[PDB]
Amino acid sequence: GSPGLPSGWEERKDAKGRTYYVNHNNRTTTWTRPIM
β-bridge partners, 9: 7, 23
Query: Edge-to-edge strands of the sheet including 19-23?
Result: 9-13, 19-23, 28-30
In the CATH hierarchy, which top-level class contains the domain 1-36?
Answer: mainly beta
**For the chain, counts of helices (H) and of strands (E):** 0, 3
Radius of gyration of the chain (CA): 9
Other CB atoms within 10 Å distance of the CB of residue 9:
19
Instruction: Kindly list the domain boundaries of the chain, sorted by start residue.
Output: 1-36
Helix (H) or strand (E) holding 23: strand 19-23
